[PDB]
Paper text:
On the protein level, for ribosomal protein uS11, we found an extra density corresponding with a methylene group between Cα and the backbone carbonyl group in Asp137, indicating that the γ carboxyl group instead of the α carboxyl group participates in the backbone peptide bond. Hence, the aspartate is converted to isoaspartate (isoAsp) via dehydration and followed by hydrolysis. In the structure, the Ser138 backbone NH hydrogen bonds with the sugar of rRNA C930, and the isoAsp backbone NH hydrogen bonds with the Pro135 backbone carbonyl group, resulting in an approximately 110° turn. A potential role for isoAsp in this position could present during the assembly, as isoAsp residues have previously been proposed to regulate protein activity by a time-dependent molecular switch. In the large subunit, most human-specific modifications are concentrated at the bottom, in proximity to the two largest ESs—ES3 and ES6. By contrast, in the small subunit, both plant- and human-specific modifications are scattered all over its surface.
Ribosomes are fundamental to all forms of life on earth. Here, we report the structure of a plant cytosolic ribosome and a quantitative mass spectrometry analysis of its rRNAs. The overall structure of a plant ribosome is generally conserved relative to its eukaryotic counterparts, including in regions that are responsible for the binding of mRNA and tRNAs.
Residue numbers in the entry:
A (entry chain R): 2 to 151
B (entry chain M): 2 to 142
C (entry chain D): 1 to 25
D (entry chain T): 2 to 130
E (entry chain N): 2 to 99
The structure:
Amino acid sequence: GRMHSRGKGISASALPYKRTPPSWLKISAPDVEDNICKFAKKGLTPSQIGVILRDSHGIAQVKSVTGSKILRILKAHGLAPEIPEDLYHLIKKAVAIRKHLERNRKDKDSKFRLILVESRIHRLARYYKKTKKLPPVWKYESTTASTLVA
Amino acid sequence: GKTRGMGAGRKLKSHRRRQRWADKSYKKSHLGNEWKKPFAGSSHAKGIVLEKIGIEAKQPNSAIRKCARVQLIKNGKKIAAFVPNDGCLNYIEENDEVLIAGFGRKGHAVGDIPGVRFKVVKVSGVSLLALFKEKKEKPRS
Amino acid sequence: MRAKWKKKRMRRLKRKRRKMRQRSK
Amino acid sequence: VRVSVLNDALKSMYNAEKAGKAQVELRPSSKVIIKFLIVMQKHGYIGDFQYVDDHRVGKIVVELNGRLNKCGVISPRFDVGVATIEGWTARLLPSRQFGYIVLTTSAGIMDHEEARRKNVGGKVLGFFY
Amino acid sequence: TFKRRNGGRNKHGRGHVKFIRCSNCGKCCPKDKAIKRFLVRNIVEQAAVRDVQEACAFELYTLPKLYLKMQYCVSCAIHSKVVRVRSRTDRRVREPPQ
RNA sequence: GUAGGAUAGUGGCCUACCAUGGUGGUGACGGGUGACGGAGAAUUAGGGUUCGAUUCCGGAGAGGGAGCCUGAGAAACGGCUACCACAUCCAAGGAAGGCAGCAGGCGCGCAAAUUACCCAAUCCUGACACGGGGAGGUAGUGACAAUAAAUAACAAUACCGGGAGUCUGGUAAUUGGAAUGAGUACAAUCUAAAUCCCUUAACGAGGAUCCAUUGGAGGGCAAGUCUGGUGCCAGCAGCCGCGGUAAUUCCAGCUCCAAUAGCGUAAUUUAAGUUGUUGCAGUUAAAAAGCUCGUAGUUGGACUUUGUGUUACUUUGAAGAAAUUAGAGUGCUCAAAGCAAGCCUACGCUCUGUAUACAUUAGCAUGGGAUAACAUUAUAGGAUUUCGGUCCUAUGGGAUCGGAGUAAUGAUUAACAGGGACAGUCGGGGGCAUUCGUAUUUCAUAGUCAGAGGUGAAAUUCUUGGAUUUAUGAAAGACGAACAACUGCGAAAGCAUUUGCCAAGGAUGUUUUCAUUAAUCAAGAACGAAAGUUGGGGGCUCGAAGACGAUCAGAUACCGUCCUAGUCUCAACCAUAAACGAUGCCGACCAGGGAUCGGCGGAUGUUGCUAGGACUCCGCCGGCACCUUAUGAGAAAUCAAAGUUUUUGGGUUCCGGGGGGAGUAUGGUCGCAAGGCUGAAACUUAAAGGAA
Ligand SMILES: [K+]
Ligand SMILES: [K+]
Ligand SMILES: [K+]
Ligand SMILES: [K+]
Ligand SMILES: [K+]
Ligand SMILES: [K+]
Ligand SMILES: [K+]
Ligand SMILES: [K+]
Ligand SMILES: [K+]
Ligand SMILES: [K+]
Ligand SMILES: [K+]
Ligand SMILES: [Mg+2]
Ligand SMILES: [Mg+2]
Ligand SMILES: [Mg+2]
Ligand SMILES: [Mg+2]
Ligand SMILES: [Mg+2]
Ligand SMILES: [Mg+2]
Ligand SMILES: [Mg+2]
Ligand SMILES: [Mg+2]
Ligand SMILES: [Mg+2]
Ligand SMILES: [Mg+2]
Ligand SMILES: [Mg+2]
Ligand SMILES: [Mg+2]
Ligand SMILES: [Mg+2]
Ligand SMILES: [Mg+2]
Ligand SMILES: [Mg+2]
Ligand SMILES: [Mg+2]
Ligand SMILES: [Mg+2]
Ligand SMILES: [Mg+2]
Ligand SMILES: [Mg+2]
Ligand SMILES: [Mg+2]
Ligand SMILES: [Mg+2]
Ligand SMILES: [Mg+2]
Ligand SMILES: [Mg+2]
Ligand SMILES: [Mg+2]
Ligand SMILES: [Mg+2]
Ligand SMILES: [Mg+2]
Ligand SMILES: [Mg+2]
Ligand SMILES: [Mg+2]
Ligand SMILES: [Mg+2]
Ligand SMILES: [Mg+2]
Ligand SMILES: [Mg+2]
Ligand SMILES: [Mg+2]
Ligand SMILES: [Mg+2]
Ligand SMILES: [Mg+2]
Ligand SMILES: [Mg+2]
Ligand SMILES: [Mg+2]
Ligand SMILES: [Mg+2]
Ligand SMILES: [Mg+2]
Ligand SMILES: [Mg+2]
Ligand SMILES: [Mg+2]
Ligand SMILES: [Mg+2]
Ligand SMILES: [Mg+2]
Ligand SMILES: [Mg+2]
Ligand SMILES: [Zn+2]
């Protein structure tokens, strides 16, 4: 189930068996990749780029039209952020809890959740260093974490 | 449950090593406290009869078990040795050399005799069995 | 004897030893 | 987590067989499971099984015929040379006349009788009878 | 030997339940274990309704009722006969009696 | 590390100088061993447990250390020098000492033989065919251990059976003739010489006294409810028990039983699936850490050819001491053994035989490539030809920098794994501030008059100085009723008046994103009811301790009255609970049924309502539970998991091994303390315990 709770939820997306684009989808691969680069330069992340394409352009899966995932397209154009998106959001959450916790010393529930979030940061950072998606000497520092994110 | 991994050889071996100590039979032999027993790991032992004593049989029996306090010659420890058979205490005199043996339960008390774990086998170099059956006689008088 | 009170009796007995041993140090 | 997909597949079949079911679904599928089934199929312990493609791992529906007493994995997968096959059969099989231990050898997945004929050793996957 | 599947109380999926105080002796008892009875009766006993109704100063008046919620500990419920010891089979019957 | 010195020679082996390294939870370092290592030994269905001083191999020592000469070889001890420890002789000035060689003695002990003969065999050594050999062999002692094997056989009578009868079988210190080695002994043989054995003249059995023993006869456990004695004594009894005047159990006789030239008694294997890898347990019997995080460790979804990256694994082979083990051959009379022998009858033969297998792990070498581990991948420093430049170097090669080509140019999928984003929600989840509620207590005002309180009954206690009771109002602190449930939230502890703010979260929804990032976790961390500790605030109520009134034989209690700490709060500690589901976490599978909580999908017609909400019906996912049932499990109680277990193996952590002593002593560590964590032994005991 969940990494840091007893939850056993299974809700998730279910990809269709048809990997090809629908017959009613006329946009070509060069046009799609032009929009993906256009959104990345505006600051959007791979997760929220695909949401816009699905909701406003009828592109259910970018891979079906272009043959590559959104992050791969951004890397080919030098638009992949230095810190991966998912690791970035964990750091932002840890910063928020610490900022809240400095004014609330007796909020022991927050202190408990801060430990879980930071341990989740270190498990993900370890993986990214092994796959060389982070600098080899990159290290998460609570003192300077708030400067990275936000 | 049990650890099953093919690479878990160390944990299984070390786990058993720790758990064997929980076994009373294993711990009695590997503790080293057997050497501190009056026999100090020996099957028999010679000693000097200090006095002839009687011990009240444990309940629900009622009798006076004839024993003898013996000081072991090799280490000077004093023990109580039961004298078996009928009227064999008359064959034992104080300050006499007696061969002692275990009572049969490896240092545990036997029967209704309280706190007695030794018995007398020989007296003055002669077995009590031979004296009891009038095979031999004690060397004196 | 109730286990709780036997536990209480032993703790009292340990305090005296703790005090009867630190008396000479 | 899912550690041995083979154990889930064989455990599902064994439970289904005892309940007297005619079919049973195995998920996920693997080429080890398929080759294990083929060994059972050749000896007439299961009927026809069908692999369903779902673009992720696939699924298998196995037809049962009521001949399978038990089938299970051996974990961990111990090494078994040809000379030690006799000891394993004396442990896992009902008798010296039926029942097969499935091995993975460098020559492929096969039962212990075929392994003796080819004089090849390997590792134990499971057994059935 | 475990006597009841519920352990004598009604608690699932929670750690602690605050206690109440027995209406009879004041003993502390978890609210989910206490025997609760909600008594509703006329504020005037049936032996005095006729006399009070004859002395009424109003042409129409409904005598109010007395609402009292009683929460007993186990010892008081058994002693006061609010509940009785039941046989092993009858212990499982949870429906109120007739 | 560099340079030397020394050594037969490598090397911090040693010196000078320089550097700051080396080892460690994959257990260094230290401690224990009644520890020489191995070949092996015992027991072993398999796996295993225990042992290994001792004849083969290796090492080490010669009373303890050290030093050394001679020599090819020794840090030699049946060589020397010194010290220390023991000890011999002396004319007292000196001198000589090393049995853990053989025998022998003392001592120690439960515990172990002759101060014998010989170089004949085996082999070793010297100048040596010849000498020497306490190595070695021979004999003596020898119930360590092992092998074979006597203590009678037969017939006829008497007696007694079975298949009136008669064949067969059984008993007798009856009666008969036969057999024979134990013993004894001419002899020969044996042997280096003797001795024993083998062979053999004579001799050698009737109660064939040429006398079988050791333990038993209640049960376990084969064998007596026999007779005499004893009377809870004496004694027996491994365990259960026997014995108190009619003892199957003690002491005896008789009889019977077991093994038998043997048998009894006092570490270790088996039994023990009571150490469990194979293969055990942990709801209640002993045993899930209070809870979560977390490193090492251990374990990790699917996918790539079917029809000079590194390893594990598997196959075959090579190498491997003998002895032992297994095993082939062989009639030492058999046997344990031994390694011999066999064939015929010549001046001999079978080249006579003296096989073979096994031998963990590590190492070496072939074949196999499923399973599995590690490593690797997208600015290819890519593969592949071809055309140059430059440099170096032989009788072309190498290195390096470029051009132009060739090609399908080069990225598995998106787990009813996990993480992250997003969406509308949901909750008594947490923190901060804030609102309200009656009650209680106190006080104020007013009214009234004799009791009020409390108990089983009373009394302590309050009260005409106005108690209790009634109305109004104020203050204080606590608490948050009813609603409130086999309901919710939280990792657990725990969480319940309103509203706002702050961060967090599960589930659901999703054709969003990453792509194995995971599971469980030594070490190490966060949180952890109540009580308790330190200080400040507060101090209604209740209330350990204390005091008093009752009750009582007593009452340090239960009941009543008053009350301290405490109860509330802040800062800081403590880390324990029946912290319980007495049930660790992750994953798969395996019956039925209704209800309920959250989210979503579909259908439907009602609302004193503003598509939606409320309700009705169908379904999906997730959660707290309940009900029926066994095809399951279990000692059962009972459990839809405590099921899918002798048809035993999904992954992982913790933890138990009869009852006590004892969560005690001691050491360590944490704490202000209280204590927490870690945690024995001596000794004691035949039951304790679970379910029914
Ligand atoms: K979701
Ligand atoms: K083991
Ligand atoms: K109840
Ligand atoms: K050297
Ligand atoms: K050097
Ligand atoms: K020489
Ligand atoms: K010789
Ligand atoms: K010679
Ligand atoms: K077995
Ligand atoms: K703490
Ligand atoms: K449900
Ligand atoms: Mg799941
Ligand atoms: Mg985890
Ligand atoms: Mg399991
Ligand atoms: Mg009871
Ligand atoms: Mg819950
Ligand atoms: Mg609780
Ligand atoms: Mg040098
Ligand atoms: Mg130096
Ligand atoms: Mg040894
Ligand atoms: Mg030694
Ligand atoms: Mg040895
Ligand atoms: Mg020794
Ligand atoms: Mg010797
Ligand atoms: Mg030797
Ligand atoms: Mg030497
Ligand atoms: Mg000596
Ligand atoms: Mg020397
Ligand atoms: Mg000598
Ligand atoms: Mg010598
Ligand atoms: Mg001896
Ligand atoms: Mg005789
Ligand atoms: Mg008798
Ligand atoms: Mg019998
Ligand atoms: Mg008698
Ligand atoms: Mg007996
Ligand atoms: Mg045991
Ligand atoms: Mg057990
Ligand atoms: Mg208990
Ligand atoms: Mg228990
Ligand atoms: Mg795999
Ligand atoms: Mg997925
Ligand atoms: Mg609710
Ligand atoms: Mg309320
Ligand atoms: Mg720990
Ligand atoms: Mg606390
Ligand atoms: Mg505890
Ligand atoms: Mg517990
Ligand atoms: Mg755990
Ligand atoms: Mg628990
Ligand atoms: Mg619903
Ligand atoms: Mg049921
Ligand atoms: Mg098992
Ligand atoms: Mg125990
Ligand atoms: Zn009550």
